[PDB]
Amino acid sequence: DIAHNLAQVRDKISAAATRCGRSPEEITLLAVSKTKPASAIAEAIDAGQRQFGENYVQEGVDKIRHFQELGVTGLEWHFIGPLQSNKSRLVAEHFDWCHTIDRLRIATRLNDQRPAELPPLNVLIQINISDENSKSGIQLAELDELAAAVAELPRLRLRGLMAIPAPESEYVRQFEVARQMAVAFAGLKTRYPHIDTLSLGMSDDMEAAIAAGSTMVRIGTAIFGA
Ligand SMILES: *Cc1c(COP(=O)(O)O)cnc(C)c1O
Numbered sequence: 001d002i003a004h005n006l007a008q009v010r011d012k013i014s015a016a017a018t019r020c021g022r023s024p025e026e027i028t029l030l031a032v033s034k035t036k037p038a039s040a041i042a043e044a045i046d047a048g049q050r051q052f053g054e055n056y057v058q059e060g061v062d063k064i065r066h067f068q069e070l071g072v073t074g075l076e077w078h079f080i081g082p083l084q085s086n087k088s089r090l091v092a093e094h095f096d097w098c099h100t101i102d103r104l105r106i107a108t109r110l111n112d113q114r115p116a117e118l119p120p121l122n123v124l125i126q127i128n129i130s131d132e133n134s135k136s137g138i139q140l141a142e143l144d145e146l147a148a149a150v151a152e153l154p155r156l157r158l159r160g161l162m163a164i165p166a167p168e169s170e171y172v173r174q175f176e177v178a179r180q181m182a183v184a185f186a187g188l189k190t191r192y193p194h195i196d197t198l199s200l201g202m203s204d205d206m207e208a209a210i211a212a213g214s215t216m217v218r219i220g221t222a223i224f225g226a
Contacts, residue, residue: 003047016210032220055081089113097122099162107150114155124162131166160197174205178212
């Protein structure tokens, strides 16, 4: 039951926030609906969920159109998969957020392809904080430079950072890696305007991520099923 699952996940987020002295409202639940049908997203919407994350462009855009045409309003769609230049127009025309900016050229493409009547596309810079097996994300040493360049693009709005840490079973290392991201996030916050989003944490490291300073957790299977 998606409604029951959503409630359970929200309770876990709230508990984790309250335990470490944070307000539950500080944490956004991003429901990750990749590979799940529109009907499952519709159940989540009926249960009050408004923020959805998609990883594949055409799948995501088809869903966005489906709910637009149904006359559902108030939804927020986040693109959280790797972006390729040949699919960027679709992201720029339909999504509200993109978490996966890891090079300047793709940001400039999105900027140039974003219609002026839409709000600026909210973007996060993706850091490869700990994953030797991933080619997504920049090194922290490259952040100052990329952030400055992306920040000038008028049809984007730089809102913070994202990371997908390497899988980690130890809580200590979950927390330590998440803190590296929180420190970088805090640093950006001190000089850049409207830095308020740290997209960090999934089901298995949710508590460590929240304790470290995440503002947004990305949950799929625990809401929608395997
Ligand atoms: C798939 C995915 C998730 C959700 O993972 P689950 O195992 O289904 O909870 C979260 N964030 C990103 C970027 C993903 O690709």
